[PDB]
Design goal:
The structure is a homodimer.
Chain A (H helix, E strand, L loop, with lengths): L10 E2 L2 E2 L7 H16 L34 H4 L2 H15 L3 H4 L4
Antiparallel strand pairs in A: 1-2
Helix pairs in contact in A: 1-3
The structure holds a DNA duplex.
Chain lengths: 105, 105
DNA sequence: GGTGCGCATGCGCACC
DNA sequence: GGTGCGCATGCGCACC
């Protein structure tokens, strides 16, 4: 874990939302923003090993969330929505920002 | 004029900068963000008449600031940097956010 | 609502 | 520093 004061608050267009209530569409939009704030870089570097975050979930490929590239079997163990929530949850935890993650509870 | 509480503050990565001291590079980055906050839309709609802001400067084409498309003569009356500052200044004025524009003075 | 995908668009490289 | 430009990338359309 490595604290990052710079992760955004779990709000969309201002309204506070918990990660568990974000829609698939909202998550897909939130995740690149979280990555920009998380790394300071303007571009995620999707797919490049050198840019794979340490907290990236293991049963998801390091790939643009634009289009789910998981294996068909991977898609049965976990829904694409649950997978996108794991991406967010894993990023906030690894930065020790559980305060922000569980704020809406 | 139409007040917009939602225009960003004239800061880059946190540091406050006046529009007159922004570098060409910084301006090119700032302007699309200003447009997003200005309109609520995710995409500027560069070139489309239906999206041309009313405050757009007259001696600049409605075109991605990525690449200066002004006529060669237009480029002599006004430098590309001065042109990009006019874009910002005109947007903040038309939204009545002179408080933000002249903050650093 | 979920999700693939078309493509506009802005990050940052390249070169002066 | 200035600026053109290559192209990765995420907004939002399309369709279920």
């Amino acid at each position: 874990q490595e604290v990052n004061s710079e992760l955004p608050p779990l709000t969309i267009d201002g309204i506070p939302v918990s990660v568990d209530k974000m829609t698939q569409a909202q998550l897909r939009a939130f995740i690149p923003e979280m990555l920009k704030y998380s790394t300071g870089r303007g571009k995620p570097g999707w797919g490049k090993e050198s840019c794979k975050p340490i907290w990236w979930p293991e049963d998801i490929p390091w790939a643009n969330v634009r289009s789910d590239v998981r294996t068909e079997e991977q898609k049965q163990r976990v829904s694409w929505t649950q997978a996108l929530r794991t991406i967010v949850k894993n990023c906030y935890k690894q930065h020790g920002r559980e305060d922000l993650l569980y704020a809406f509870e």
